[PDB]
Structure 1
């Protein structure tokens, strides 16, 4: 059975890495096995299941993966980001903390970590994360806006206002620039 397993594994992972998610599901389903667990197969089929609309199914494979390989950052990134997308903000936080510590130049991860924290009512911590994201991309208007909103939710209107104004200044630079390309 090994020749057969390795055929569907290699072909499936190839499809998934190329963005051929549907063909990745078709192939990797024929090798994935919960008892003889393989993290690279579970990761790619998880990705493929989320991309093709089986988001609960996919996240469950990613959860089984992160249980088997707790320090795998590529799993943690997918799964943490996917949690924010379905508002499982509380599960998202520990994964995104760990990914941000390992890849400190990943803007999206730090941004979504802030969003998760803000949703959980941890406004000072969200702001901390938003400020680190802003260090990475200081011309991101959405980050000042997110920081303004977290302040406002604490009743810190004085600290919010300069952030709203800066976000507006930056959004004017940005969306106009993109439309002129």
Structure 2
């Protein structure tokens, strides 16, 4: 266990990458060290803790990791998305804002940001994120539906309506209009 410690590190990270998160916890717990901080071990063990229900230990390792490596978009993403999931929206929002700007092709982040903003009552900001998300994925019914709800809350029924109708059209399946549009 310098050699054994390298074995558990590499194997543990391997497991975390693969989604074998229980096993990743069992192995990376043997190598993690708060006071000789290794951000790859802490990030992957943080993820694995969050995925196995140890959300408080996980968000701890991830805050520590993000304090150590403020550049780490991977770390900021899982921490932001985790906070969204546990509904700590005051924490989630600034992380997701910063990740969305660092990584503008990440649709899930932009959507989840818009959903959070909507749930805080920041309907204008939500609408702005949902429009960005639709620019990434124009045929995601769930975004058309989310943005229609935000417009409606602001009394913008005229603007909501086309998005409502699109959401319901996409639920059924294919838009017949595309029969007439060249590719």
Q: TM-score, normalised by structure 2?
A: 0.90
Tell me how far 1:4 sits from its aligned partner. 3.7
Tell me how far 1:118 sits from its aligned partner. 1.0
Distance 1:66 1:177, change over 3 A: farther
Look up the SS of the partner of 1:174 in the other structure. Answer: coil
1:90, 1:116 within 8 Å by CA — same for their partners in 2? no
Matched residues in 1 for 2:175 and 2:105: separation?
24
Tell me how far 1:75 sits from its aligned partner. 0.4
Matched residues in 2 for 1:14 and 1:166: separation?
42
2:151, 2:157 within 8 Å by CA — same for their partners in 1? yes
Matched residues in 2 for 1:54 and 1:167: separation?
36
Distance 1:7 1:106, change over 3 A: same
1:114, 1:126 within 8 Å by CA — same for their partners in 2? yes
Q: TM-score, normalised by structure 1?
A: 0.91
CA RMSD of aligned residues (A): 3.4
Look up the SS of the partner of 2:33 in the other structure. Answer: coil
Tell me how far 1:47 sits from its aligned partner. 0.8
1:144, 1:166 within 8 Å by CA — same for their partners in 2? yes
Partner of 2:7: 7
- 1:116 is aligned to 2:116: yes
Question: Which contiguous aligned blocks of 4+ residues in structure 1 show a shift greater than 6 angstroms?
Answer: 174-181
Matched residues in 2 for 1:149 and 1:163: separation?
9
2:110, 2:132 within 8 Å by CA — same for their partners in 1? yes
Matched residues in 2 for 1:179 and 1:125: separation?
35
Look up the SS of the partner of 1:138 in the other structure. Answer: coil
Q: Can you list the C-alpha shifts for 1:68-89, whole angstroms capped at 9, x where unaligned?
A: 1111011011111111111112
